[PDB]
Amino acid sequence: VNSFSGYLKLTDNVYIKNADIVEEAKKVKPTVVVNAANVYLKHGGGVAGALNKATNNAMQVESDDYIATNGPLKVGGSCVLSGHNLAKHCLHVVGPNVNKGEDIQLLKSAYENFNQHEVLLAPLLSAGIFGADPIHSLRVCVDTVRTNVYLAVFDKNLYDKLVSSFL
Ligand SMILES: C[C@@H]1CCN(c2ncnc3[nH]ccc23)[C@H](CO)C1
């Protein structure tokens, strides 16, 4: 039993909800919140910009030190950093950005990072400003993640379409 509330159950382990991941994180304070990161951990917009703003830019400061030490992530890769005031940990995961020409096949690799954590709060990878089809992203999530994932979908209209079209 966990403290996530109000989710629809898609499968044994995947739950979905219309919610602002920032407000969800602030309420649940989960062990792991997933960020929709880029390889530079530049949290300018989308989910990443919103999560960073909620940390008063502390996420960005930590991220800049990480990059200065380690260099960029791989597309499809991840790193674990602090969750600041939002969660114990933040798993920064880089899904392909279609608006950069990045291979959508890397979306499965991106979701594989979730399997290293028993329970996660997460957005749909490569959705929004990353330019992928959120319906495809949900399918890859369900077919790749085996741990317990609680998906927050900000857009109510998008949430209803994902549920009504889910196979
Ligand atoms: C994944 C894409 C980009 C961002 N995204 C979000 N999903 C959940 N929580 C969020 N908080 C702020 C943005 C956001 C969009 C959902 O409409 C689609």
Compute φ and ψ for 148, nearest 5 degrees. -85, 115
- How many residues would you count in the chain? 167
Strand order in the sheet with 89-93: 8-9, 14-18, 148-153, 119-122, 32-36, 89-93, 78-82
Among 157, 155, 153, smallest CA distance to 8 is for 153
Q: Is the CB of 76 under 6 A from ligand 1?
A: no
PDB resolution in Å: 1.0
152: Cβ below 6 Å to ligand 1? yes
PDB experimental method: X-ray
Cβ of 124 below 6 Å from ligand 1: yes
φ/ψ region of 29 (left if φ > 0, alpha if ψ in -120 to 50, else beta) reads left
User: Residue 32 pairs with which residues in a beta bridge?
Assistant: 89
**Burial grade of 14 (CB within 10 A; 0-12, 13-18, 19 or more):** buried
Which domains, from first to last, does the chain contain? 8-163 (3.40.220.10)
Q: Which atom of ligand 1 is nearest to the CA of 124?
A: 1
The Cα 61–Cα 64 span in angstroms is 5
| 1 CA from centroid of ligand 1 (Å) | 26
Tokens of 104: 């959508």
